């Protein structure tokens, strides 16, 4: 709703008086089904999803991470609508300091480069952004904030239901004599993630 | 400040430079380690307790897994947190009630039981040799004049009366739900209370329970003896929820 | 020959059609600050005769900081909207390039262009990317920045007192900023952007809910009473959040829950602390 | 006791009027279960509140005036001290909020003014003063306030009460201005500006503190520009607030435009939502006088001196 | 002070409220003293200019 | 099996400070604010009893507690510790009454309580209490208002404030309050100085007030607090 | 080396061995006179009209420094600048007092 609709069914969004969503960030225990969501989204939606593992963006050439980000939003800015999907932001995710190595300064800027684009003056249009992380405890205050990230999307460890629900999905392609102990497996299976 | 530490203020129960007690906070964290959630709702003429009954294995006598305890024939409690600590605190509560009746010649009020237990845990908070208990007790019972009562005590020494409360993993969410559903002002009958509590837990966990996945304690004005509902009557309450 | 006023800065005057748009309207409940910038640039920039005669000494650069969402980037959009001079939007994250001199070459440009345009607003969103004090000459990356600072520094005070060019720098972490920046001359007026309170919120709420329609019975008052301390920005996640809930079920205009959800959807910071500590 | 009230309230809340209901209201006070009437009197007050505005719906607040002494003794034998402050503040207030004889107000006010002392909670004694000084200004007698306020200057400062000091400075300043003294009155307004800055503001009060300055900026003719900036804001206040005084400032806000010779900004002032919410004799006037000017005609202005003087005659 | 037989001084201290006029007394004298008046704080900018980093404050 | 740590946890720093005491005071200056005014014919204590929700029953725990029939208490800081001190103060009061068959003087109860607080800065194995107490009393015609801090030191006040923003509250009291005040006016200025911080619509269940005149100490009913909160 | 900080109680001991900070001089807060003087110096910068009693201003002042006063003056001008008036009467200053003592009372 936040992401797909505000594109093919935003023409009436203004009829409520609300700009399309801004950004969405998964954030959950390692294995809650985050990385599998970006895949499912770009597979179904299909439009212009550009995935950035937020790691291979870093180089070493002064502002080599500023140009990558500029081109990312530029390409997209022109090419929009486009989905921006960043895998693990904890990299550029950062948090700032006071301070750290002369290296950290590079990331920050770079960490800021995006922040200034997501908001700043020129107003993102059509092009939307999915933020990815495991552990959101690390992120900069100035990033989580609306105008940058709209609403955070939590993905908790599947319930006994969610387990069972997911359990019959991965074990569905297995040769199993009329003895499938789904209610037993799921039961003992607690705190167990999706993988 | 804002997270500052000095000396042993994160190991024993002494003051941090910003005036915190870190071991107590850690005890609160220890409550959630059980991975359970309990809901307590006070009615016009009753009090209801409800709790997940996680019996992960059929190799366990499912009758011996209970977080509901009889403190007195007319005072019930539900424990949330570290199991063995919970039982310790239950024994202490039992003793304090019995002793109260023996010295004062009337039945202990939940208010004073909770206050007593709390008072005991504050000592753990203030003495260095021992560590707080990683548990949380919620007491219910009918007082002679104040009507139905639900109280709750913490690992630090805090205790309070409630219209409705919860403890454990989904505490904040259950409080949000309940504080939404209390403002609506409805005739809090018995079934209204039971349904409210059960649905609070159910929606908070998104489960829709079997009658063997939860346990429901109760106390009424018409029947003040703390009664633990059989699986049958629980189910009777369950099927009535898939009607409206 | 002497190339007339040119070069990157990097764009050049924004143009006109690229207006920040955000009209003074949207930006509400910010008199002091609002007035402050107005008092810092808008007015001082225009009426110069009372700055010299009335013995006022106008300021050269203005610093904007505070929490992240209290509304500084809006303040620049508003100024570039009503404005009249030449609003240069140069990001401090662009100055450092893959070249050994590009940075100064720009500053000499933006500053060069500023002189040429007219009473122009140079605006630097997030000067952190340039000025972060704790420099380190050796990494061969710091060297480039420091100078960029020195560049900013040199052309920062090099003007003439007459050069009608104001400097507007926005940053939340108003801390990792070499004091060399905040010195009477380079960055005089220092302005703060609080995370609203009660009244302000009312203006922020009323202004946010004034863009849509909504149930006229309801009263975003209940919410304003609360503390939470929601920033001017977050209050926006709610207004938008309500639409998602009101639109997800199809229905022009919102409901109680639409805000309730928003309040529970935005605030988030439910717990926080403990009840014994007080 | 309770038998009547709620049922009577349920009867009252229905329709008819307080006056019929007064037979119950008066009876509420007159009755019934002789609780004390403790809570009843509070609810009898609930009438005497309504019943007061119902008293006003007829003019017995003069009745209740004398009874106000009795009600005192009546809460005195049932209503605690505090209970009086609230009960004794719902009569002197709701009574002043209505247009009637100055005396009965002054008479009663003065009464209860002196009552606070005989009881002795200087806190209310000062609060009631604001009304006593304000009423002495509108009523007629000016020299009266002069002494009252000049005695009240240290009555709020001792505690540093801040908004009451401004009120007396604002409110009292007006008395001086009318007494034909813009120097002193002016000086009084200036003093308030400095005092008002020390503390919060807050809203309405701040509007008087503005408009009033707009007034002084037009009392001696000192650029209708500096005054206009007070009228505009001071209009904004009453606008997004009680909206009772806002209707007043719109007038002066337009005055500056009429003098400045800009009927364009007057067109700007007449736009529906902003004020037009008032459409009446306040806008029609200044509009007709404005474009009447643009025509640079005198015949026209003369006729707008004629037909719309119903307000113009009532001004200072 | 040499003529009196007393080791002249080198170091001074100024202590009080913050913002009453201490730097001035250090600047004004220094100004009125025709002596280079230096302001050594801890800015990395300053070290890169004056001192090529070196390793201390000598 | 168990004994007790026998060594002091509160020890002198090289500067000569008892660091744990100042950190305990830091815990006090983080609790809900409380104001106390001695007013010629009586004493007023008030405090912010602000909950976290609508679920907590505010008619169940109180912060303004009676010690005897003529002495009352409020606190700033940690709750449980306050509870302990209140029990102990009631006990001390009753010891005194057994022995002298005369209700304990407010100064003496303050002394005794303070001694208890000082013990936990010198006995072994413990932290100091994280509580400041305001103790009001009526004895010998005059009214009495004392404060005791975690060090075990006590001071007599005409008026004072503790907890969050206690400095601004204190200044406000220094200005907007003076002698010859009747208890009613004192209640007024107390709720007034509490409002200088209460972030909320100060209701009749958001604050707790107690009085102490020469008719005994008592807690003001929610009704009475509503009446007083109606200005 | 002039090393001029605040609260001598902050500086270490090794920096106090009686001989090592030749002349230890201390700054006093600024009273009516000093302020008055300071007040006259800063107000001299801007265009100040007649009928301006500065003393009255420092009297209202209570706990300011060498910088604070500067803020007051500036605002006085700042206030007059907004009033569209080149000069700066006494009233203005009397406001700035608060406006600064607003800040003086603020953070
Ligand atoms: N809800 C789920 N349904 C099916 N498979 C899942 C689910 N969650 C996790 N998995 C398994 O784990 C993988 C997804 O891991 P992922 O969510 O990317 O972890 P992380 O969040 O640490 O990146 C999938 O390839 C799948 O095999
Ligand atoms: N009083 C207000 N009026 C209008 N918008 C506001 C107000 N307060 C907050 N906002 C909203 O919050 C956002 C503020 O963004 P901004 O302050 O630029 O963040 P940053 O400091 O990270 O650039 C804007 O989108 C603005 O609409
Ligand atoms: N005695 C004084 N007379 C006039 N101005 C002063 C005085 N003391 C300080 N100031 C003002 O303070 C500013 C410099 O403050 P300074 O004293 O250097 O800071 P600090 O208080 O940290 O020493 C100057 O602009 C000056 O106007």
Residues in Cβ contact with C144 at an 8 Å cutoff, skipping those fewer than 6 apart:
A62, C96, C100, C103
Question: Which residues on adjacent β-strands are paired with residue F43?
Answer: F38, F212
> How many Cα neighbours within 13 Å face the side chain of B233?
10
User: Are E15 and G30 within 8 A, CB to CB?
Assistant: no
What distance in angstroms lies between residue B67's CA and the mean position of ligand 2's atoms? 49
CA nearest to C38 within chain G: G82
Task: Decide whether any atom of ligand 1 lies within 6 Å of the A29 Cβ.
Answer: no
CA A64 vs. chain centroid, Å, equals 23
User: Are C179 and E43 within 8 A, CB to CB?
Assistant: yes
| Distance separating alpha carbons of residues G61 and G58, to the nearest angstrom | 4
Nearest-Cα distance to chain G for C53, in Å, is: 7
User: Are F57 and B162 within 8 A, CB to CB?
Assistant: yes
Task: Decide whether any atom of ligand 1 lies within 6 Å of the A163 Cβ.
Answer: no
Query: Could you tell me if D209 and D196 are in contact, meaning their C-beta atoms sit under 8 angstroms apart?
Result: yes
Structure tokens at C216: 């006229």
Query: Could you tell me if C188 and C36 are in contact, meaning their C-beta atoms sit under 8 angstroms apart?
Result: no
Query: CA–CA distance from E9 to each of D45, E39, G19 (Å)?
Result: 83, 19, 10
CA nearest to F51 within chain C: C275
Query: Could you tell me if G53 and G61 are in contact, meaning their C-beta atoms sit under 8 angstroms apart?
Result: no
Query: Could you tell me if B12 and F7 are in contact, meaning their C-beta atoms sit under 8 angstroms apart?
Result: no
Query: Could you tell me if D292 and D304 are in contact, meaning their C-beta atoms sit under 8 angstroms apart?
Result: yes
Q: D98 phi and psi, to 5 degrees?
A: -115, 150
How many Cβ atoms from other residues are within 10 Å of residue G58's Cβ?
24
Give F18's DSSP letter.
B
Angle value at C-alpha C270, between C265 and C272, nearest 5 degrees: 145
Question: Which residues on adjacent β-strands are paired with residue F18?
Answer: F12
Domain that holds residue D247: 9-316
Pairing of strands C61-65, C190-192: parallel
Query: Could you tell me if F113 and F63 are in contact, meaning their C-beta atoms sit under 8 angstroms apart?
Result: no
**Resolution of this deposited model, Å:** 3.5
Pairing of strands B159-162, B148-153: antiparallel
Query: Could you tell me if D256 and D228 are in contact, meaning their C-beta atoms sit under 8 angstroms apart?
Result: yes
Rg (C-alpha) for chain E, rounded Å, is 16
| Distance separating alpha carbons of residues C203 and C256, to the nearest angstrom | 20
- Is E touching G (3+ C-beta pairs, cut-off 8 A)? yes
B152: three-class secondary structure by DSSP: strand
What distance in angstroms lies between residue A191's CA and the mean position of ligand 1's atoms? 14
State the structure-solving technique.
cryo-EM
Number of domains making up chain D: 1
Which candidate, D51, D46, D1, D61, places its Cα nearest to that of D22?
D51
User: Are C133 and E53 within 8 A, CB to CB?
Assistant: no
CA F223 vs. chain centroid, Å, equals 22
Q: What is the DSSP string of F182-198?
A: -HHHHHHHHHHHHTTT-
CA F83 vs. chain centroid, Å, equals 12
Cα dihedral: F175, F178, F183, F185 (round 10): -50
Structure tokens at A18: 């609300």
Extract long-range pairs of D237-241: CB within 8 Å, 24+ residues apart: D237/D203, D237/D204, D237/D206, D237/D207, D237/D210, D238/D204, D238/D207, D239/D274, D239/D275, D241/D203, D241/D204, D241/D207
Residues in Cβ contact with B179 at an 8 Å cutoff, skipping those fewer than 6 apart:
B164, F53, F54, F55
Nearest-Cα distance to chain G for D138, in Å, is: 29
| Distance separating alpha carbons of residues B211 and B215, to the nearest angstrom | 8
Domain ranges of chain F: 3-231
| Distance separating alpha carbons of residues D288 and D300, to the nearest angstrom | 9
* Beta strand spans in C25-157 (E): 61-65, 87-89, 120-125
Give D59's DSSP letter.
T
Burial of D188 (0-12, 13-18, 19+ CB in 10 A): buried
Length of chain F: 231
Chain G residues near residue D197 by CB distance under 8 angstroms = 95, 98-99, 102
Query: Could you tell me if B19 and F127 are in contact, meaning their C-beta atoms sit under 8 angstroms apart?
Result: no
Task: Decide whether any atom of ligand 1 lies within 6 Å of the A169 Cβ.
Answer: yes
Tell which residues of chain E come right before a gap with C–N over 2.5 A: none
| Distance separating alpha carbons of residues B136 and B152, to the nearest angstrom | 7
Instruction: Report the b/e string of B20-38 with b at 16+ CB within 10 A.
Output: bbbbbbebbebbbebebbb
Domain that holds residue B198: 1-244
Nearest CA to ligand 1 atom 26: A195
Query: Could you tell me if B72 and B79 are in contact, meaning their C-beta atoms sit under 8 angstroms apart?
Result: no
Handedness of CA C211, C214, C220, C223 (dihedral sign): negative
Q: Does C275 reach chain B within 8 Å, measured CB to CB?
A: yes
Which candidate, B57, B58, B53, places its Cα nearest to that of B35?
B53
Angle value at C-alpha D88, between D83 and D94, nearest 5 degrees: 130
Length of chain B: 244
Alpha carbon distance, N-terminus to C-terminus of chain A: 27
Query: Could you tell me if F79 and F118 are in contact, meaning their C-beta atoms sit under 8 angstroms apart?
Result: no
Which candidate, A6, A9, A45, C240, places its Cα nearest to that of A37?
A45
Kindly give the number of the ligand 3 atom that is closest to the alpha carbon of G37. 3
Which candidate, C255, A163, D160, C84, places its Cα nearest to that of F193?
D160
Question: Which residues on adjacent β-strands are paired with residue B68?
Answer: B78
A96: three-class secondary structure by DSSP: coil
Query: Could you tell me if B90 and B83 are in contact, meaning their C-beta atoms sit under 8 angstroms apart?
Result: no
Among left, alpha and beta (phi > 0; psi -120 to 50; other), residue F160 is: beta
* Chain A stretch 122-151, residues whose beta carbon is closer than 8 A to a beta carbon of chain C: 122-123, 141-142, 145-147, 150-151
Angle value at C-alpha C32, between C27 and C34, nearest 5 degrees: 35
Length of chain A: 195
What distance in angstroms lies between residue A172's CA and the mean position of ligand 1's atoms? 16
Nearest-Cα distance to chain G for E11, in Å, is: 5
| Distance separating alpha carbons of residues B125 and F81, to the nearest angstrom | 9
| Distance separating alpha carbons of residues D148 and D132, to the nearest angstrom | 8
* D214, containing H or E segment: helix D204-219
| Distance separating alpha carbons of residues D106 and C156, to the nearest angstrom | 67
| Distance separating alpha carbons of residues D314 and F171, to the nearest angstrom | 47
User: Are C180 and E45 within 8 A, CB to CB?
Assistant: yes
Cα dihedral: G77, G81, G85, G87 (round 10): 20
Query: Could you tell me if B169 and B136 are in contact, meaning their C-beta atoms sit under 8 angstroms apart?
Result: no
Give F134's DSSP letter.
E
Structure tokens at D251: 């007038």
Instruction: Report the b/e string of C141-159 with b at 16+ CB within 10 A.
Output: bbbbbbbbbbbbbebbeee
Q: Which CATH number is F3-231 given?
A: 3.60.20.10
User: Are C277 and F200 within 8 A, CB to CB?
Assistant: no
Interface size between C and F, measured as CB pairs under 8 A: 20
Residue with tokens 């929606």: B203
Query: CA–CA distance from C124 to each of A69, B30, C83, C131 (Å)?
Result: 19, 48, 16, 11
- Is C touching A (3+ C-beta pairs, cut-off 8 A)? yes
Task: Decide whether any atom of ligand 2 lies within 6 Å of the C61 Cβ.
Answer: no
Question: Which residues on adjacent β-strands are paired with residue C88?
Answer: C122
Structure tokens at G30: 């600024």
Which candidate, G96, G98, G97, G88, places its Cα nearest to that of G52?
G88
Query: Could you tell me if C126 and A112 are in contact, meaning their C-beta atoms sit under 8 angstroms apart?
Result: yes
Q: Which residues of A are annotated as a binding site?
A: 28-35
Q: Does F177 reach chain D within 8 Å, measured CB to CB?
A: yes
CA nearest to C260 within chain B: B180
What distance in angstroms lies between residue D306's CA and the mean position of ligand 1's atoms? 85
Whether C265 has a binding-site annotation, put simply, is: no
Query: Could you tell me if D43 and D10 are in contact, meaning their C-beta atoms sit under 8 angstroms apart?
Result: no
Query: Could you tell me if F46 and F191 are in contact, meaning their C-beta atoms sit under 8 angstroms apart?
Result: yes
Task: Decide whether any atom of ligand 1 lies within 6 Å of the A103 Cβ.
Answer: no
CA nearest to F33 within chain C: C278
Chain F residues near residue D160 by CB distance under 8 angstroms = 175-176
* B179, containing H or E segment: helix B171-182
Nearest CA to ligand 2 atom 18: C73
Residue B9's CATH number: 3.60.20.10
| Distance separating alpha carbons of residues B144 and B163, to the nearest angstrom | 17
- Is D touching E (3+ C-beta pairs, cut-off 8 A)? no
| Distance separating alpha carbons of residues C158 and C155, to the nearest angstrom | 5
Ligand having the closest approach to the CA of E15: 3
Instruction: Report the b/e string of G3-13 with b at 16+ CB within 10 A.
Output: ebebeeeeeee
CA nearest to A117 within chain C: C91
Angle value at C-alpha B220, between B218 and B221, nearest 5 degrees: 160
Nearest-Cα distance to chain B for A183, in Å, is: 11
CA nearest to A3 within chain C: C244
Which candidate, C145, C96, C100, C137, places its Cα nearest to that of E48?
C137
| Distance separating alpha carbons of residues G74 and G42, to the nearest angstrom | 9
Kindly give the number of the ligand 2 atom that is closest to the alpha carbon of C70. 17
Query: Could you tell me if D135 and D110 are in contact, meaning their C-beta atoms sit under 8 angstroms apart?
Result: no
User: Are C270 and B160 within 8 A, CB to CB?
Assistant: no
Q: A112 phi and psi, to 5 degrees?
A: -85, -35
Instruction: Report the b/e string of D85-102 with b at 16+ CB within 10 A.
Output: bbbbbbbbebbbeeeeee
Tell which residues of chain F come right before a gap with C–N over 2.5 A: none
Query: Could you tell me if B143 and B87 are in contact, meaning their C-beta atoms sit under 8 angstroms apart?
Result: no
User: Are F32 and C278 within 8 A, CB to CB?
Assistant: yes
Give A30's DSSP letter.
T
What distance in angstroms lies between residue A131's CA and the mean position of ligand 1's atoms? 17
Chain F residues near residue B111 by CB distance under 8 angstroms = 60
Residues in Cβ contact with C116 at an 8 Å cutoff, skipping those fewer than 6 apart:
C4, C5
Pairing of strands A83-86, A128-131: parallel
Kindly give the number of the ligand 2 atom that is closest to the alpha carbon of A142. 22
* Beta strand spans in B96-230 (E): 135-142, 148-153, 159-162, 164-168, 214-220, 227-228
Nearest CA to ligand 3 atom 13: G67
User: Are C98 and A98 within 8 A, CB to CB?
Assistant: no
């Amino acid at each position: 709703e936040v992401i797909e609709l505000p594109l093919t069914n935003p023409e009436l969004f203004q009829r409520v008086g609300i700009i399309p969503p801004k950004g969405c960030l998964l954030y959950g225990p390692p294995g809650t089904g985050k990385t599998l969501l970006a895949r499912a989204v770009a597979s179904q939606l299909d439009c212009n999803f550009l995935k950035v593992v937020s790691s291979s963006i870093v180089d070493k050439y002064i502002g080599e991470s500023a140009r990558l980000i500029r081109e990312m939003f530029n390409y997209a800015r022109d090419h929009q609508p486009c989905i921006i999907f960043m895998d693990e932001i904890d990299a550029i995710g950062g948090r700032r300091f006071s301070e750290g190595t002369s290296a950290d300064r590079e990331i920050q800027r770079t960490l800021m480069e995006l922040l200034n684009q997501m908001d700043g003056f020129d107003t993102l249009h059509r092009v939307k952004m999915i933020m990815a992380t495991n552990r959101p405890d690390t992120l900069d205050p100035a990033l989580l904030r609306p105008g940058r990230l709209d609403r955070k999307i939590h993905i908790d460890l599947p319930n006994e239901q969610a387990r069972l629900d997911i359990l019959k999905i991965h074990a569905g392609p297995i040769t199993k004599h009329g003895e499938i102990d789904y209610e037993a497996i799921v039961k003992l299976s607690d705190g167990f993630n999706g993988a | 400040s804002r997270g500052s530490s000095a000396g042993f203020d994160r190991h024993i129960t002494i003051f941090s430079p910003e005036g915190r007690l870190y071991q107590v906070e850690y005890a609160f964290k220890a409550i959630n380690q059980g991975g359970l959630t309990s809901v307590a709702v006070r009615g016009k003429d009753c009090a209801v307790i409800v709790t997940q009954k996680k019996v992960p294995d059929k190799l366990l006598d499912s009758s011996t897994v209970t977080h509901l305890f009889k403190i007195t024939e007319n005072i019930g409690c539900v424990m949330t947190g570290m199991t063995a600590d919970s039982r310790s605190q239950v024994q202490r509560a039992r003793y304090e009630a019995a002793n109260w009746k023996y010295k004062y010649g009337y039945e202990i009020p939940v208010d004073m039981l909770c206050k007593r237990i709390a008072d005991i845990s504050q000592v753990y908070t203030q003495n260095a040799e021992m560590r707080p208990l990683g548990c949380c007790m919620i007491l219910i019972g009918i007082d002679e004049e104040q009507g139905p009562q639900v109280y709750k005590c913490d690992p630090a020494g805090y205790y309070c009366g409630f219209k409705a409360t919860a403890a454990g993993v989904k505490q904040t969410e259950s409080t949000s739900f309940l504080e939404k559903k209390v403002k609506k002002k409805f005739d809090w009958t018995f079934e209204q209370t039971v349904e409210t509590a059960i649905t609070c837990l159910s929606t908070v966990l998104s489960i829709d329970f079997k009658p063997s996945e939860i346990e429901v304690g109760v106390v009424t004005v018409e029947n003040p003896k703390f009664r633990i509902l059989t699986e049958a009557e629980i189910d009777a309450h369950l099927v009535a929820l898939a009607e409206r | 020959d002497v190339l007339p006023p040119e070069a990157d800065s990097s764009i050049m005057m924004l143009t006109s059609d690229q207006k920040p748009d955000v009209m003074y309207a949207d930006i509400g409940g910010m008199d002091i600050q609002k007035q402050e910038v107005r008092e810092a640039v808008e007015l001082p920039l225009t009426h110069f005769e009372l700055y010299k005669q009335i013995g006022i000494d106008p300021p050269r650069g203005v610093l904007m900081y505070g929490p992240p969402g209290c509304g500084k980037t809006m303040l620049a959009k508003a100024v570039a909207h009503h404005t009249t001079a030449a609003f240069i939007r140069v990001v401090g994250s662009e100055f450092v390039q893959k070249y050994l001199g590009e940075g100064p070459r720009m500053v000499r440009d933006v500053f060069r262009l500023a002189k040429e345009n007219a009473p122009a607003i140079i605006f630097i969103d997030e000067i952190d990317a340039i000025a972060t004090k704790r420099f380190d000459a050796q990494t061969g990356a710091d060297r480039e920045v420091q100078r960029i600072l020195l560049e900013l520094l040199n052309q920062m005070d090099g003007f003439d007192q007459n050069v009608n060019v104001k400097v507007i720098m926005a940053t939340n972490r108003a801390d990792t900023l070499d004091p060399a920046l905040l010195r009477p001359g380079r960055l005089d007026r220092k302005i703060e952007f609080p995370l609203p309170d009660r009244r302000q919120k009312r203006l922020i709420f009323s202004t946010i809910t004034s863009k849509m329609n909504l149930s006229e019975e309801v009263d975003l008052e209940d919410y304003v009473a609360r503390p939470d301390k929601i920033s001017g920005a977050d209050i926006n996640s709610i207004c938008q959040e309500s639409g998602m809930l009101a639109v997800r079920e199809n229905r022009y205009i919102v409901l109680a829950k639409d805000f309730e959800k928003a309040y529970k959807t935005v605030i988030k910071k439910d717990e926080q602390e403990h009840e014994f500590y007080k | 006791a309770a038998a009547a009230v709620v049922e009577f309230q349920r009867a009252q809340s229905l329709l008819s009027t307080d006056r019929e209901a007064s037979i119950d209201i008066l009876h509420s006070i007159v009755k019934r279960d002789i609780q004390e009437n403790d809570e009843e009197a509070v609810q009898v007050k609930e009438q005497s509140i309504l019943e007061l505005g119902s008293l006003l719906a007829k003019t017995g607040q003069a009745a209740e005036l004398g009874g106000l002494l009795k009600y005192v003794r009546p809460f005195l034998n049932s209503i605690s001290k505090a209970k009086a402050a609230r009960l004794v503040r719902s009569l002197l207030d709701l009574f002043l909020d209505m247009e009637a004889a100055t005396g009965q107000e002054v008479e009663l006010c003065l009464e209860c003014i002196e009552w606070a002392k005989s009881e002795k909670r200087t806190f209310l004694r000062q609060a009631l003063e604001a009304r006593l000084v304000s009423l002495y200004f509108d009523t007629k007698r000016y020299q009266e306030a002069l002494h009252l306020g000049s005695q009240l200057l240290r009555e709020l400062k001792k505690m540093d009460d801040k908004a009451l000091l401004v009120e007396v400075q604002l409110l009292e300043s007006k008395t001086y201005h009318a007494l034909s003294n813009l120097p002193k009155a002016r000086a009084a307004l200036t003093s308030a500006r400095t005092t008002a800055n020390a503390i919060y503001c807050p809203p309405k009060l701040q509007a008087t503190l503005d408009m009033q300055s707009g007034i002084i900026h037009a009392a001696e003719e000192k650029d209708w520009k500096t005054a206009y900036s007070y009228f505009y804001e001071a209009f904004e206040g009453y606008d997004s607030i009680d909206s009772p005084k806002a209707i007043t400032s719109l007038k002066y806000m337009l005055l500056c435009k009429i003098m400045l010779n800009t009927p364009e900004d007057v067109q700007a002032l007449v736009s529906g939502k902003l004020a037009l919410r008032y459409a009446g004799r306040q806008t029609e006037a200044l509009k007709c006088v404005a474009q009447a000017s643009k025509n640079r005609s005198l015949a026209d202005f003369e006729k707008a001196l004629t037909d719309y003087r119903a307000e113009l005659r009532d001004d200072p | 002070f040499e003529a009196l037989g007393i080791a002249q001084p080198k170091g001074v201290l100024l202590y009080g409220p913050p913002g009453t006029g201490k730097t001035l007394l250090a600047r004004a004298v220094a100004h009125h003293t025709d002596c280079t008046f230096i302001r050594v704080s801890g800015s990395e900018l300053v070290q890169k200019f004056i001192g090529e980093g070196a390793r201390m404050v000598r | 099996a168990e004994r007790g740590y026998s060594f002091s946890l509160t020890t002198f720093s090289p500067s000569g400070k008892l660091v744990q005491i100042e950190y305990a005071l830091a815990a006090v200056a983080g609790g809900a604010p409380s104001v106390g005014i001695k007013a010629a014919n009586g004493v007023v204590l008030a405090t912010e009893k602000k909950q976290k929700s609508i679920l907590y029953d505010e008619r169940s725990v109180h912060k303004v507690e009676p010690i005897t029939k003529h002495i009352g208490l409020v606190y700033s800081g940690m709750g449980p510790d306050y509870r302990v001190l209140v029990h102990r103060a009631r006990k001390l009061a009753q010891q005194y009454y057994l022995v002298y068959q005369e209700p304990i003087p407010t100064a003496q109860l303050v002394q005794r309580v303070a001694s208890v607080m000082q013990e936990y800065t010198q006995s072994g194995g413990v932290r100091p209490f994280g509580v400041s107490l305001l103790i009001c009393g009526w004895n010998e015609g005059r009214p009495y208002l004392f404060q005791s801090d975690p060090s075990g030191a006590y001071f007599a006040w005409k008026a004072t404030a503790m907890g969050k923003n206690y400095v601004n509250g204190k200044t406000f009291l220094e200005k907007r309050y003076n002698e010859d005040l009747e208890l009613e006016d004192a209640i007024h200025t107390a709720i007034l100085t509490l409002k200088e911080s209460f972030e909320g619509q100060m209701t009749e269940d958001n604050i707790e007030v107690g009085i102490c005149n020469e008719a005994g100490f008592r807690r003001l009913t929610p009704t009475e607090v509503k009446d007083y909160l109606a200005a | 080396v002039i090393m001029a900080t605040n609260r001598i109680d902050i500086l270490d001991s090794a920096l106090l061995r009686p001989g090592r900070i030749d002349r230890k001089i201390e700054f006093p807060p600024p009273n009516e006179e000093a302020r008055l003087d300071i007040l006259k110096i800063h107000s001299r910068k801007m265009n100040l009209t007649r009928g301006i009693n500065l003393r009255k201003i420092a009297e209202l002042m209570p706990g300011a420094s060498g910088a604070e006063v500067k803020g007051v003056c500036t605002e006085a001008g700042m206030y007059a600048l907004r009033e569209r008036r080149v000069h700066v009467t006494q009233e203005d200053f009397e406001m700035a007092v608060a406006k600064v003592m607003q800040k003086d009372s603020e953070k």
